[PDB]
RNA sequence: AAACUUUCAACAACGGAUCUCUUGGUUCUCGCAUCGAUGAAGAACGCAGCGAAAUGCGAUACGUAAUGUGAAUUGCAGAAUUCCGUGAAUCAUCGAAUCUUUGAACGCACAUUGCGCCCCUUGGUAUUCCAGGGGGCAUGCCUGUUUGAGCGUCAUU
């Protein structure tokens, strides 16, 4: 038998594997949703 | 005698009845079987040369691609080469795409446009800090994979 200095039993640590999907989630990455031309819309030309 | 009051007619008012009209309603009959985690129904906010609503659409925003028809659209402006043609159109069809923030709504929260973690990549003299872009992290259950727990228990050292 093992020696257990603590009377509390904890969940053992087990191996966790990274995902290895057999097909891509979307197969086409989306382009930049905020490029320079979308960030700046138009200058403001009021007198102030 | 006037004014005034009342009754009738004409013309003019007030009001919207009547008649006629109808792209609506109602009832009966016939045929068909197709919503959603491949993100539905619903909600919010946006999108047009000039638009508030309705209708349509999603930063590709009154639309993109494709197919058909074969010359419009129309309130104005504009564009004209689009006219014996891969080609006009607020046209029809529709099998390819886009599809903001949400919503059964799924990283955690939500009277907050609040707060984390992981992978790839870029910049800031950076595996650790900060920032940009792309891709991810809900719950119950089933089959399988892998890593384990218990003198529950077998055999052998």
Q: Å resolution of this model?
A: 2.2
Which of A24, A25, A26, A2 shows the shortest CA–CA distance to A12? A2
Residues by CB within 7 A of strand B: list them: A 1-2, 12, 14-15, 17, 19, 25-26, 28-34, 38
State which nucleotides on strand B lie below 7 Å from a protein beta carbon.
59-60, 98-99, 132-136, 146-151
Q: Straight-line distance from CA A23 to C1' B47, in Å?
A: 35
A10-42 b/e (C-beta count within 10 Å ≥ 16 → b): eeeeeeeeeeeeeeeeeeeeeeeeeeeeeeeee
Place of tokens 């138009």: A42
- Rounded to 5°, angle at Cα A18 from A17 and A22: 115
């Amino acid at each position: 038998l093992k020696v257990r200095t603590s009377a509390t039993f904890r969940l053992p640590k087990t191996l966790k594997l990274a995902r290895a999907p057999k097909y891509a989630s979307k197969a086409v990455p989306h382009y930049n949703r905020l490029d320079s031309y979308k960030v700046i819309e138009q200058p403001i030309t009021s007198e102030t």
